[PDB]
Structure 1
């Protein structure tokens, strides 16, 4: 029925392989998991937006589960990022528009991703950004009540400072922060710091506003103004998405 033709990458749980149908030659992405999975499936079925991977279905063989997702012809945003360069500012702005739309949708249905980074942002045939990999995603709003998060997870260069330092924190500002690191990656082709901690010299340099160093040097003043509002240490002062949508660079016509 299915031939694991190429391994695509490791998810938080198990791996995802490019599977080819041996009857139609259908190229599709499948996540294999032998034995939280109840939760990742529940969440995938809630998901319906142009900037979130299309969810197909699931089947169990013993304690081995199968998740099928729309294969991304474009691959990952990571592969569109030239090390030490990034990408043309107009392409960065379009991907950031689509990433915001994806994130507005997810937060709208009380879901937080918790691992936004270029490896998990896929591109379709016409280069549309899709947020994939819901293995860390969880509900932060249900029956119109916010739940605070208390599980540390994600990728250290992407995680917000509050997640390293607070017992509990709001979900939405954590996703916004990781969108800021992604914007940094797209415009500079490098990550600013290993982790946003007081011990980390690059992160201290940023707090003390030294934007004459890298990667901020390589970033035009308009997008850097926006990164100034996103990468704010106190999550309560950090810009929200409604207010990102009012940002000058965000509304700047480009190309």
Structure 2
């Protein structure tokens, strides 16, 4: 086989898988998760992670640059959201709402901070516990981008020599963040129905053509169990035109998210997580 770097071994006792491994911080005897990336773009991912501070975004605890990259992260005992939706499995509407609300807060925080994830999927959504009512965290910032652009500098001069395709691109520039809202729409569709909106399964139309047209597969029997408000939100995120597509703010103001009970349950989970870290405060 091979061995772990001495620097890692100095601080952690390595254990079983879920490349992610379980490890114990020697100083605290606390469980951690160690992400092993095969061997530079990882340094930017580290840089992004170190700067972000949100309860629905994964936190980096340590980093080791050796024969491979070792990323020490907070352990999520609930695993991936993928495991909850795989093989036609579906979540109860109330659970979709609690998880989705947190995904929206996380993505709104990202967008506010000039970061686009670009790889939102159930595999990149982690659950804090094996309980249905838990905290979620967004992970896998490898494909992420940082939002002055080259276009702004180009527009500052006279366009005597400027190409038409550049001037045409001014219409859509600054809408890259909308790709995350589309991904959230697909995640929400999957969570509610237990099936993907766009697939090659039992269809003639190509996966590409389904997406560009925005003609998702609607199965009435599956969706009758789901509320009209939840489906209305999906429809608003699954809008082909990125400029018309719902933003995280528009999604957060949607009737489906105006649920005081769901919001209370989230604030409750937050308080419970923070209970171990809370310092006495000035009264």
Same fold, judged at TM 0.5 (above):
yes
> Which residue number in structure 2 is paired with residue 5 of structure 1?
15
Q: Which residue does the alignment assign to 1:164?
A: none
Select 2:117's aligned residue among 103, 113, 116: 113
Task: Report the 3-state secondary structure (helix = DSSP H, G, I; strand = E; otherwise coil) of the residue aligned with 2:191.
Answer: helix
Query: Which among 214, 217, 230 is matched to residue 223 of structure 1?
Result: 230
Among 245, 251, 254, the alignment partner of 2:252 is: 245
Query: Which of these two proteins has the greater Rg computed from alpha carbons?
Result: 2
2:75 aligned to 61, 71, 75, which one?
71
The within-5 A match list for 1:172-211 is 172-194=177-199, 199-200=206-207, 203=210, 207=214, 211=218
1:127 aligned to which of 119, 126, 134: 134
The question of whether the paired residues in 2 share the 8 Å contact of 1:40 and 1:134 is answered with yes
Q: Is the 8 A contact 1:113 1:137 kept in 2?
A: yes
Counterpart of 1:236 (choices 243, 250, 259) is 243
Q: Quick one: distance in 1 between partners of 2:95 and 2:215?
A: 30
Structure 2 unaligned residues grouped into runs of 5+: 1-8, 153-171, 263-283
| Bigger shift: residues 226-235 or 75-84 | 75-84
CA contact (8 A) 1:192 1:202 kept: no
Q: Is the 8 A contact 1:90 1:254 kept in 2?
A: no
1:94 to 2:98 alignment? yes
Contact 1:99 1:131 in 2 (8 A): yes
Equivalent pairs counted in the alignment come to 223
- Structure with greater helix share of residues: 2
More strand by share: 1
Q: What TM-score comes out, normalization by structure 1 length?
A: 0.75
Q: For residues 159-202 of structure 1, what are the alpha-carbon distances to aligned partners after superposition, in whole Å with 9 as ceiling and x for unaligned?
A: xxxxxxxx98832110001111111111111112138xx73399
Q: Which residue of 2 aligns with 1:104?
A: 108
TM-score by length of 2: 0.68
